[PDB]
Every structure is written in structure tokens, then in C-alpha cells.
Design a protein around this ligand. Structure first.
Ligand SMILES: Nc1ncnc2c1ncn2[C@@H]1O[C@H](COP(=O)(O)OP(=O)(O)OP(O)(O)=S)[C@@H](O)[C@H]1O
Ligand SMILES: Nc1ncnc2c1ncn2[C@@H]1O[C@H](COP(=O)(O)OP(=O)(O)OP(O)(O)=S)[C@@H](O)[C@H]1O
Ligand SMILES: [Mg+2]
Ligand SMILES: [Mg+2]
Lengths: 254, 320, 626
DNA sequence: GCAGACACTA
DNA sequence: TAGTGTCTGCT
DNA sequence: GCAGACACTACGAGTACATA
DNA sequence: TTTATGTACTCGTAGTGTCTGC
């Protein structure tokens, strides 16, 4: 059935190492479009969305849509056994109890064929829905990650204010402050180091420390991330994938 | 070095639920569960050697022989059981997706579960509550009082009783025809008397008789293994004359190489389990026997202490 | 007419078969012992014909079966109310003489229609799930075109809604009223509660015996109101660190699935459901104090489910939450539910058997369903013949509490000739070993507060008390030997006998007062504290005093009272300097002054003397020292 | 054992 | 709103 | 090459049990 | 709760080593 030949293993390893920290049991859905995975953590506060297109696979082949719900601890343990130049290849049989993933080396001697048992995760339908967001600001993912880490040096107090049409991060905490004012991220020299805000009357929002701390751990996939804010809708931090997309839904604390 | 033949205990272990003898009602219930397949969580308890874990293994084998290797997790006291090494493994096994026949479920056999930590049982409570649709549990312990109350609530209690002489005799004759060994009825009754309901003890004693003498008679059986010391202690405590008890003690325990502490503990157990005499007499005997036990434990272990204990037993029995 | 037949029976003023369900609508109370059937066996035959067997004698009681000897309260109650009395000889002819259905008596007719109503409601709900089963099967067939009957009975027959629960209706409604009015208390800043008083309590608590439905009730109340259930348990760690890193951020955050599940007004909130609070087996590394901090500060409804509340481990939960107590439900609701289950499962059990099944299992409904599922595999007829074997095979050996252990141990029946055969010595040893850490203390506390019934001929009560005290002292010696450097823990059964079984077997009978908790723990703590203070003041006055701590209390301390309190009494504040001069001489502080006064007993108690001293006189003494 | 509260019935 | 039947904590 | 970044073993503190 | 060793368990922390990266 499923024969999803990746070109190599680094991107998949980065994806798993990114979203493995928050959720513990993801449910992959196999479709001709690609790989769809929606995961909710144990606190029911953060949601993880995976969309990987058929372009991101070398030779992808799916006959029937099969549900492959696997653990992330065991998947990480298996994927720590893989090199970088090897070609990861996900294989699933008919009505698969276990998913077979194998690495092919360019040395042409080494075939490491690990079979991973599949868990029985409850069948949850696609709860995703198109929503309009009040604030939509984007910056390079490394810059956002380091700024969020500086904000999270303090306990839980994060504040974003858009007064005077300029973005300031005046954060507080239990002892000390994290009021790191960021300059307007505009640079014609580097197109990736750019900023873009959709105003729609923004005021402020406060998140949790571990929430964005786990959001920023997936920074390896995309150069820049579009941070989205909505008043009555779950938040969105969508990373850009060459063949799909990766967004982390979140509910802002009240 | 020469290899060893398989012991008769494990060579003739039953593989189906029809070969196991003893509690007919419990085995019939197990066979009806076998036919239906919807096996509930069960706790199996009894004194050692009456067919507890072999019945669980036979039930699992007949339920899913093709998947015994895949969907049966046999954790036990030899394996490391704790809070995390149990919760992680059992949760992974219970959430594991394995395709059974419609009436079959994965079986988690917790053999020797009376030694488990209470927090492990607390986690097991929610494990069984959540994943009862896919996996089923099967405890097997000697003492069922160690298992916490909620687990016994969320389980089907199956109590095993010690086998009567008829069932042990039937199994002994079956194994004798299978092994083709000569025997005498007196030797077989001696083996049954020595076993005291334990089938494994009966098999061990029969094999020892066969391999040491060849003919299963009373003389050979009593040569290899002695009469149980609880019985000799019971008849020592119940004797009429003090001289009779003194000589029984000396000859049958002191000259047979029995430790004084063992004799005192056996006397305590017999007097606790003794029935013909009055309750207050047993309480007084236990009090003075415990005084003697304290004397033995402090270091004074001699024949004189046991003789004095017997003298006090008789001074209590003759009513001053 | 049952009443007409009962009048024809010759009463007393000091066994054959019968028609099925012939004692219907008849109340039976058993007192004394019967020559043919013992109390348990006669009660089985009393319930064999649908007769309610109450445990207490009443004015509305119809007939009482009289034996030989029982509690004096029953003997005085029967005589004054002139209740009908029939001996065991009349019981045998009662079975044959009474026709089926209990006749047309007023009590019998009322019992039958209630029993028919119980069967009627059983049949009404029997096809409710059957119609539902046909509904889901048709829906499942359509989905397949465009697993059941292999499930645990405790799961498929789970309460669909709050109306399907059995018992604890008041507790369930209390929880529902607390949950539905949590937002109202949130608006009022948890200051003033309502008539029930649940408004001030931010979080509710559920505690009760296993199998009665705490988890199901909490989940159903959460689901009905539309809340999102956030549940934790013992399967995952709940120590301080991951509690701070887990649900701590969920106190004021909503469901990400809550937005995507939507009219619902409570669909985007959390109801924290911590089942098995007893699994936090940690005094410091455990999360019990952390959960207390959540009870202090939480912006969302929170619910706890445990089994026993009174453990010292769970002490910080004393006055924290709306304590909702569940209990063993009465046999009628379980009777109706089991009738529904039996109708739906095509196996039949007699309706009177359900009472014995509940009595055997001690009000554990889930274990009752497990018993039914296990028995129904091969034994399809649960009736009068199999009930005894089923009960003695599935009896639940629940460990007893210390008070129940003391009450059971000081009974004169179990040390009688007939009583001890049923309750052997090993049973008493196990009864001790249930709570061996507390049992000797509970025996010693109230072994002389009971009226003995096992007195030997010519032996007074005081002699039995003396023998019991001697054996308690011997058991104390054995206990000291056990808990010492040698650690002779193989000697435990001897201590069991000497400290609980022998002392009780001499003074057993009926308690004159009530089962009292041991006073040795509190007095021991007080003595340890007083020893600590004695050491502190002794080493404060160590210089210049050639006397140890024992001689300080016996000799020195009575003299200090008449140098440090009598000037306050005979001349008041005029001797403020002299008292301070003596107090400063022995390096005594102000704290030591109050400590010395509490060491006195009898006629030298200074608590009243200091109280009578005017506050103006005492105020100056403190200020001058400072 | 001594209350003490929760029900069913009156 | 008031009699029983029965489960439950007393430290 | 050097400084983190990680997962790993090891040590220490605390709780609980000790006859069927 | 006291109880006085020894065992077993659980957790938390501190070092200890190795792998990524620049
Ligand atoms: N009822 C029985 N029928 C046949 N063989 C039996 C029976 N009971 C015990 N045996 C034999 O006893 C041996 C081992 O018995 P087990 O069932 O392993 O003992 P057990 O019941 O597990 O007791 P413990 O508590 O585990 S020591 C095997 O050789 C079995 O064949
Ligand atoms: N009041 C009740 N009425 C009907 N069925 C019940 C009732 N209480 C329990 N049950 C049955 O028992 C099953 C499990 O009950 P639970 O609510 O899990 O017991 P519990 O109160 O949680 O006790 P624990 O948590 O095991 S100590 C349910 O699915 C029902 O089948
Ligand atoms: Mg075994
Ligand atoms: Mg529960």
C-alpha cells in the first residue's frame, strides 16, 4: 500500500524532533494528496497540524487511504538509528499492524529495515476550519525563536502591543522583565528578513511559556513563520513547507 | 558433561484445559470462556501447586495460538515490575493495534501479582478501565489479599481449592501409564499423603521414587522423603502422657535433624490450626509456645527448652 | 388474605417446602438462635419466599421469629409493643400453610404491585437499548455500504445519562447543582455561597467505596452540561514538576478542540477530573499539596475523585472542597438494573437473589455485573440452589477499619463454642493483621469499657480485666522485642495473640459505651513535646545546677513556682524586678516562664492562677524584660 | 457501640 | 413534615 | 577546535513494608 | 505519628559522556 520514498531522512527527522516535544501520539493519515496528521497534547490546549505534499516524496504511491497512528517516542527511537545520506522509505501493508521504515545507503551494502508497531488512537475527524485572524505578523523563524526564548526567560508574562503602527514586545515576569523591543524587520538586502502585518485592529494577547517554547522548537523546517492572532478563533503559527504546510493551532489563555 | 532429561513436572504440564484436574466448575467456566472468547479480567488464587498459572497459559494458548507470541505479554516477578517499567510497557501493549478474531482480545498475564507495588496497581486500574476493549488482564497470585480493592472490583474472582485425593490419584495414574513404571497401591497412597494436595510435590516425589529405587512402594517412598513434620508435631502436642510427647519429640524431630526453631514455629502453626481442643486451651498453649519461641530466638536453642514447653503443655492439659 | 391466615397461627406468649413467593409482603426479624436452622440459614429460607428481612425491630414489624438469646434491646422491644411472635416450630408450618403470592393482605398486595412495577420498568427499558441497538446497526450498515456483543458488561451497560445511575441521587444532584452554578460563583468572586453552600467552594470532591459510580457520575455531569472533560489519573506521573508543567497552564486556558466543536456556552472550558487521588503516594514529592494550591487558585471548575478521604497522606484536603460523599446504594435500583440486564442477556435469575448478591459483594455494582457475566457462561440458572455456592465463592474479603476491628474483636459470640467454629483462630489473627499497627492500641483503649459475656463461672469482671491487662503487658514486651535492633518480625503472630486475641477473649461481650479511639497517641505526642520543653529549660538552667532533667521536674520546678508566681499572687506587680532577677539568674527567658507553668498537676495547677492575675500586672512584666 | 445523615413510606 | 432501614465516620 | 545540547549512569533523599 | 534494621522503590539531581554546530 503506502510506499512513501523520501529523498532523504533529514527533513522527516527534523519534523519529528520539532513536533515531538509537545504531542505524544500523532495520527498520520495517508492520502494521494500526501500525509495529514492532526495531534492534540495531553492538556487539550495545543494542536499540531501536518501537511506534506506528494512533491516532498521521491516516489510516493498510495492505493487506499489508510490510518497510521504511531507513537512519537518509539518513532524517535527508530529514527535515531538512521544516517543522513540514506533514503527513508515508509512502507505499509494491507490492514497494517506495523509500519515498515527502511534506510538505503549509498554504500550499497547497508539496508536497515525497522518495523514499528502501530498504536490504536481514537478516530477523530478533521476539525480544522478556515478562520480569519486579526493580527498576522511574520518574521524569520530563528529571530522569532530567539525573541520568544528571551520572552520565556521570565515565567509566564508575555505582551505584544501594536501602538503607533510599530511592533513592541514589552513582556514582564515574576522577577525581572523581558521587554525586548524589536526593530521593524525590513531589509531589501535579504528578502527572507522581512516583516508584514495585517492590521485589522490589533490590541494585545498573552500566551503560555511552554506553548510557544514548543512552537519554536520546529524552527528548522521553515526560514520564516507567519504568526497569526485572532480574537475568537484558535491562534496559528504556520510554517512553510516546500510541498505542504505546518501550522500549530493554539488557544490563547484567558 | 551430560545433558539432563526433562523433569516430569514440566514434561507433563497440561497444554489444554481438559487435561488439568481439580476444580471441575472453574475449569468448565474456563472452557466456556474459551468457546465464547469474551474473557473478562480475572484473578486466580489458591495455595501453590494446584494449577493456577498452567490454566492461564492453557486458556491463552487455546484462545489465540496463532498470536500467542504477538498479543500476549507475560510479565512476572522475575521480570522487573515497578511504576514506570509497568505503566509504559502495559500502556504500549494495550494501545498496540493488533488484529484478532472478533471474539479475541490481547491478554496481559500478571503472574505472581501479590508482590506488586500499590502504585503500580493504581496505574493498572486506569489501564484496565481505559483499554478493556482491546486488552484483558489475568492475575495469578497465591494470596489474593495483596491486590488492592479496586482491582478486585474490576475483575472476575476465580478461587482455586486444594485438590482432593481422587484428582491427584487420577493424574498420578495417567502419568504412570504414560511413563510405564511399576508401582504398588501402598506407595501411591503414600505419595498422595505426602503431597497434601500439591500436585507438583506429588510429581516430584513420584519421580524421585522412580529414579532412586524403581518401584513405587511405601518403603521406598518413606525412604526418600519423610512424613511431614506438621503431622508429627500435631501428634506430639495431642499425646496423652508427657513421656510419650517427650519421646516423640526426641526420636522423630531431634534425632531426625530438625532445627528447634522449626519445631517451635511448626508447633505454633499447628496450635493455631488445631481444632479438636477448646479455644482457651489453644490460646494458653500459643502463649506459652510463644514464650518458648522468644527464648529460642534470643539464642537459647536446646532440647531442654522444647522439653519444658511440652511439660507446660501437659501442665495446662491436665488442668493443674 | 395474609392477615387472616396469620391470625389462625397459634402465637407464643412467654422443615417442609412451600409455595413460591408465599411470604410476600411479610416482615421477618430474627432474634435468638433456632434449633433447626441457624440465623444465616434461616435468613436464606426467609428470603427464599420474597420476605423482607430487616435488621432492626420496629413498631410496624408484623412477625418476629424468636430464638434463645440475643441483644437485650430486642428483648425489651418485643414485649412492650405486643408484636406477633412465632417460634421456629410455627415457622415450619408457616411455609406450607401460606399460599403463593402472599394472599390478598394489604401489605402483601402493596408489595406485589411494587414488585410488578419493578418488573414493569425493567421491561420498559429492556427494549430501549434494543431499539437503540437496531438504530446503530442500521446506521453502521449504511456507513459501511456508503465492535459490539464482544465487550465487558460493565462497559456496554454503563449509564448513558444521569437517569440510568443506581443510588446516590442526592449526591449526583448536589454535584450537578454545584457545576451548573460555578459560573455564578465566579461572577460573585466566590465570596457568598447559596442555600446549599457550594458557591464558596471552587472545586468539588467525590469520595466513596469502589464500584458505586463516582467516575461515571462525574463524567456524565460534565458531558450533560456541555463542558470539555480534562482528566488525569495514575497512569501518568502527577508529581510536583509535571503538575507545574501540565495542568498549571490549563487553569485559565480553553480547549483548542472547543472552538472546532462548534448552541454551546460551556464547550470551551475545562473541568479537571483527577480520578484516583490516592495514587499520589508522596508526602513531599507527591502532588497533594500542589492540588491544594489549585484549590486555592483556579479559574475553571475542578473535580477530584478518590476512595478513602481520612488517610493522613490526604490530610491537606480537610476543608478545601465541596465534599460530596457517595455510599453503597440500596438494593432496589440495582435490582431493577439487573432485571433489565438479565432480560437483555437471555438468562434468568430470581429477583430475591439480587439482595444476596449485593450483600455478598458489599455494594459493588461493577463487581456484581462481573459476577453475572462470569456465572452466566455455564450456569444459566442463578436460583435458590446455586446462590450459596456463588456467595461463598465470590465473597469479598475487604480489610476492616480499626474501629470495626475493635468492635468485631470484642464480641462474646465469636469466643463461644458454636461461634468459634465459624470464626476460627486464624480468622482472628487475620483480623488483627488487617491493621496490626493500630489493633493492640484499640484493644487496650476499650477492653475495660465493655460488659463481658465470656466470664468464667465464679470469675468477676475485674479478674478478667486483670488477666487481659497482664497479657497486654506481655504483648507489649513482645512488641518491644519485635521493634528493636534484632528486628524479630517472625514473632508477629505471638504479638497478635498476646496483644489482641487473648485480652479480648477474656472481656468480650457487649460494649457499655462506644468504640473509643486510642488515647495513647495524643498523650504520647504531648509527653514527647513536654520532654522537649523540659530539656530546653533544663539546659537553659544547666549552669550552676547539679541536677539532671528528671530531678528538675520532680524537685526544682515546684520550687520555681513559688519564686516566680507567688510574688505575682501575694504582692502583684510590686515584685516585678525580683521575679526578673530570679529569672535572669538562671538564664531563663520569657518563653521558659510560660513553659514551666504547664508542668504541674493536681492541686498545683497554675492555669487558673495566671488567669486570675490582672492584665495590667502581667503587661508590665513582659515589657520590662524586653 | 454511638450517633448522624440519607432516603422510602406515611 | 414525621417513623424506620440502612450505610458511615469516631482519631 | 571549542561551547553548548543532549541523553546517559550514578548518587542521595524519602516513603513503605516487615506472616503466611 | 511513636517504634529501629534492612530491603525495595521512587524520585530528583549532579556529573559524565557524546553528538551538532561554526
Ligand atoms: N490440576 C492440575 N492438573 C494437572 N497438573 C497439575 C495440576 N495442578 C498442578 N499441576 C502440575 O503442577 C506443575 C506446576 O503447577 P503450577 O500450576 O505451575 O503451580 P501453580 O498453580 O502455579 O502454583 P504457584 O502458586 O504458581 S507455586 C505442573 O507439572 C502441572 O502439570
Ligand atoms: N450507580 C450505578 N448504576 C449503574 N451501573 C453502575 C453504577 N456504578 C457503577 N456502575 C457500573 O460500573 C461501571 C464502572 O463504574 P465506575 O464509575 O467506574 O466505578 P467507580 O465509582 O469509578 O469506582 P472506582 O473508580 O473503580 S474505585 C460502570 O460502567 C457501570 O457499568
Ligand atoms: Mg505459577
Ligand atoms: Mg474512578
Amino acid at each position: 500500500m503506502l510506499e512513501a520514498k523520501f529523498e532523504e531522512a533529514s527533513l522527516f527527522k527534523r519534523i519529528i524532533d520539532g513536533f515531538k516535544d509537545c504531542v505524544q501520539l500523532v495520527n498520520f493519515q495517508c492520502k494521494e494528496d500526501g500525509i495529514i496528521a492532526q495531534a492534540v497534547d495531553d492538556s487539550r490546549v495545543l494542536l499540531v497540524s501536518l501537511e506534506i505534499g506528494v512533491e516532498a516524496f521521491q516516489e510516493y504511491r498510495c492505493d487506499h487511504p489508510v490510518t497510521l497512528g504511531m507513537d512519537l517516542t518509539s518513532l524517535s527511537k527508530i529514527l535515531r538509528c538512521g544516517n543522513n545520506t540514506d533514503t527513508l522509505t515508509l512502507i505499509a501493508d494491507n490492514t497494517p499492524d506495523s509500519i515498515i521504515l527502511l534506510f538505503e545507503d549509498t554504500k550499497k551494502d547497508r539496508i536497515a529495515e525497522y518495523s514499528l508497531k502501530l498504536m490504536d488512537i481514537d478516530a477523530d475527524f478533521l476539525k480544522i476550519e478556515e478562520l480569519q485572524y486579526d493580527s498576522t505578523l511574520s518574521l524569520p523563524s530563528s529571530e522569532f525563536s530567539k525573541i520568544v526564548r528571551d520572552l520565556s526567560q521570565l515565567s509566564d508574562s508575555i505582551n505584544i502591543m501594536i501602538t503607533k503602527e510599530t511592533i513592541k514586545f514589552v513582556a514582564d515576569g515574576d522577577i525581572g522583565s523581558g521587554s525586548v523591543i524589536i526593530k521593524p524587520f525590513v531589509d531589501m538586502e535579504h528578502p527572507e528578513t522581512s516583516i508584514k502585518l495585517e492590521m485589522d485592529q490589533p490590541v494585545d494577547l498573552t500566551f503560555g511559556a511552554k506553548y510557544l517554547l514548543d512552537i519554536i522548537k520546529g524552527s528548522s523546517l521553515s526560514d520564516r513563520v507567519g504568526i497569526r492572532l485572532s480574537s475568537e478563533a484558535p491562534a496559528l503559527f504556520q510554517f512553510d513547507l516546500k510541498s505542504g504546510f505546518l501550522q500549530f493551532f493554539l488557544a490563547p489563555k484567558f | 558433561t551430560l545433558s539432563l532429561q526433562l523433569p516430569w513436572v514440566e514434561k507433563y504440564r497440561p497444554q489444554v484445559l481438559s487435561d488439568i484436574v481439580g476444580n471441575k466448575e472453574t475449569i468448565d467456566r474456563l472452557q466456556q470462556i474459551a468457546k465464547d472468547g469474551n474473557m473478562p479480567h480475572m484473578i486466580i488464587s489458591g495455595m501453590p501447586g494446584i494449577g493456577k498459572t498452567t490454566s492461564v497459559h492453557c486458556l491463552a494458548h487455546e484462545l489465540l495460538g496463532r498470536s500467542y507470541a504477538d498479543g500476549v505479554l507475560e510479565l512476572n516477578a522475575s521480570d522487573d515490575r515497578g511504576i514506570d517499567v509497568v505503566r509504559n510497557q502495559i500502556k504500549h501493549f494495550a494501545q498496540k493495534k493488533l488484529h484478532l478474531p472478533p471474539g479475541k482480545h490481547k491478554i496481559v498475564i500478571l503472574d505472581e501479582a501479590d508482590s506488586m507495588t500499590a502504585g503500580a496497581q493504581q496505574a493498572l486500574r486506569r489501564t484496565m478501565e481505559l483499554y478493556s476493549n482491546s486488552t484483558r488482564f489475568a492475575f495469578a497470585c497465591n494470596q489474593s489479599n495483596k491486590i488492592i480493592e479496586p482491582l478486585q472490583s474490576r475483575c472476575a474472582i476465580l478461587r482455586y481449592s486444594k485438590l482432593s485425593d481422587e484428582d491427584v490419584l487420577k493424574r498420578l495414574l495417567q502419568i504412570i501409564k504414560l511413563e510405564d513404571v511399576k508401582y504398588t497401591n501402598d506407595g501411591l497412597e503414600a505419595i498422595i499423603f505426602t503431597a497434601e494436595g500439591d500436585m507438583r510435590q506429588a510429581i516430584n516425589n513420584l519421580q524421585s521414587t522412580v529414579a532412586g529405587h524403581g518401584l513405587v512402594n511405601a518403603d521406598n517412598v518413606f525412604k526418600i522423603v519423610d512424613s511431614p513434620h506438621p503431622l508429627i508435631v500435631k501428634k506430639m502436642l495431642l499425646a496423652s502422657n508427657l513421656e510419650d510427647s517427650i519421646q516423640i519429640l526426641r526420636t522423630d524431630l531431634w534425632k531426625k535433624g530438625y532445627s528447634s526453631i522449626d519445631i517451635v514455629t511448626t508447633s505454633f502453626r499447628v496450635t493455631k490450626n488445631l481444632a479438636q481442643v477448646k479455644e482457651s486451651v489453644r490460646l494458653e498453649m500459643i502463649k506459652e509456645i510463644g514464650l518458648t519461641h522468644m527464648r529460642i530466638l534470643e539464642g537459647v536453642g536446646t532440647y531442654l527448652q522444647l522439653a519444658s514447653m511440652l511439660a507446660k503443655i501437659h501442665k495446662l492439659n491436665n488442668k493443674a | 388474605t395474609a392477615q387472616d391466615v396469620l391470625d389462625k397461627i397459634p402465637s407464643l406468649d412467654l422443615f417442609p417446602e412451600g409455595k413460591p413467593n408465599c411470604l410476600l409482603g411479610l416482615t421477618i426479624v430474627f432474634t435468638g438462635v433456632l434449633p433447626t436452622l441457624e440465623r444465616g440459614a434461616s435468613e436464606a429460607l426467609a428470603k427464599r419466599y420474597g420476605a423482607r428481612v430487616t435488621k432492626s425491630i420496629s413498631s410496624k414489624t408484623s412477625v418476629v421469629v424468636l430464638g434463645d438469646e440475643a441483644g437485650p434491646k430486642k428483648l425489651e422491644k418485643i414485649k412492650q409493643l405486643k408484636i406477633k411472635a412465632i417460634d421456629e416450630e410455627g415457622f415450619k408450618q408457616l411455609i406450607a400453610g401460606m399460599p403463593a403470592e402472599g394472599g390478598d393482605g394489604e401489605a402483601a398486595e402493596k408489595a406485589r404491585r411494587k414488585l410488578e412495577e419493578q418488573h414493569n420498568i425493567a421491561t420498559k427499558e429492556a427494549e430501549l437499548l434494543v431499539k437503540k441497538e437496531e438504530e446503530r446497526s442500521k446506521k453502521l450498515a449504511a456507513t459501511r455500504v456508503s465492535r459490539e456483543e464482544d465487550k465487558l458488561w460493565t462497559v456496554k451497560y454503563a449509564p448513558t445519562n444521569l437517569q440510568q445511575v443506581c443510588g446516590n441521587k442526592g449526591s449526583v444532584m448536589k454535584l450537578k447543582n454545584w457545576l451548573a452554578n460555578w459560573e455564578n460563583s465566579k461572577k460573585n468572586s466566590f465570596k457568598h455561597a447559596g442555600k446549599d453552600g457550594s458557591g464558596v467552594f471552587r472545586a468539588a470532591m467525590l469520595y466513596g467505596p469502589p464500584g458505586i459510580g463516582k467516575t461515571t457520575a462525574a463524567h456524565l455531569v460534565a458531558q450533560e452540561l456541555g463542558y470539555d472533560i480534562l482528566e488525569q489519573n495514575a497512569s501518568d506521573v502527577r508529581s510536583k514538576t509535571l503538575l507545574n508543567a501540565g495542568v498549571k497552564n490549563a487553569l485559565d486556558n480553553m480547549s483548542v478542540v472547543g472552538y472546532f466543536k462548534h448552541q454551546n456556552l460551556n464547550g470551551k472550558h475545562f473541568v479537571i477530573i483527577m480520578d484516583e487521588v490516592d495514587g499520589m503516594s508522596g508526602g513531599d514529592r507527591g502532588g497533594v499539596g500542589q492540588l491544594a494550591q489549585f484549590c486555592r487558585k483556579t479559574s475553571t471548575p475542578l473535580i477530584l475523585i478518590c476512595n478513602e478521604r481520612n488517610l493522613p497522606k490526604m490530610r491537606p484536603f480537610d476543608r478545601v472542597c465541596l465534599d460530596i460523599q457517595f455510599r453503597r446504594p440500596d438494593a432496589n435500583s440495582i435490582k431493577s438494573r439487573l432485571m433489565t440486564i438479565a432480560i437483555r442477556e437471555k438468562f434468568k435469575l430470581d429477583p430475591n437473589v439480587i439482595d444476596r448478591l449485593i450483600q455478598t459483594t458489599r455494594g459493588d455494582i461493577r463487581q456484581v455485573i462481573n459476577l453475572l457475566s462470569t456465572i452466566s457462561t455455564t450456569t444459566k440458572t442463578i436460583n435458590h440452589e446455586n446462590i450459596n455456592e456463588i456467595s461463598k465463592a465470590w465473597e469479598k474479603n475487604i480489610a476492616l477499619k480499626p474501629f470495626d476491628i475493635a468492635h468485631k474483636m470484642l464480641d462474646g459470640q465469636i469466643y463461644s463454642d458454636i461461634g468459634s467454629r465459624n470464626f476460627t483462630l486464624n480468622d482472628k489473627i487475620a483480623l488483627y493483621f488487617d491493621d496490626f499497627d493500630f489493633t493492640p492500641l484499640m484493644i487496650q483503649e476499650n477492653y475495660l469499657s465493655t460488659r463481658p459475656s465470656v466470664l468464667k463461672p465464679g470469675q468477676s469482671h475485674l479478674e478478667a480485666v486483670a488477666e487481659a491487662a497482664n497479657c497486654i503487658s506481655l504483648g507489649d514486651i513482645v512488641e518491644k522485642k519485635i521493634r528493636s535492633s534484632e528486628q524479630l518480625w517472625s514473632l508477629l503472630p505471638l504479638h497478635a495473640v498476646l496483644s489482641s486475641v487473648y485480652p479480648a477473649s477474656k472481656v468480650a461481650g457487649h460494649m457499655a459505651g462506644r468504640i473509643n479511639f486510642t488515647a495513647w497517641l495524643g498523650q504520647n505526642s504531648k509527653s514527647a513535646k513536654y520532654y522537649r520543653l523540659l530539656q530546653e529549660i533544663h539546659y537553659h538552667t544547666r549552669l550552676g545546677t547539679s541536677t539532671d532533667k528528671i530531678g528538675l521536674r520532680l524537685d526544682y520546678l515546684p520550687t520555681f513556682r513559688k519564686r516566680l508566681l507567688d510574688p505575682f499572687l501575694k504582692q502583684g506587680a510590686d515584685a516585678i524586678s525580683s521575679v526578673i532577677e530570679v529569672m535572669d539568674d538562671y538564664y531563663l527567658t520569657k518563653e521558659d516562664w510560660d513553659s514551666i507553668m504547664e508542668f504541674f498537676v493536681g492541686p498545683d495547677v497554675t492555669t487558673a492562677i495566671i488567669k486570675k492575675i490582672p492584665a495590667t500586672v502581667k503587661s508590665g512584666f513582659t515589657r520590662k524584660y524586653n
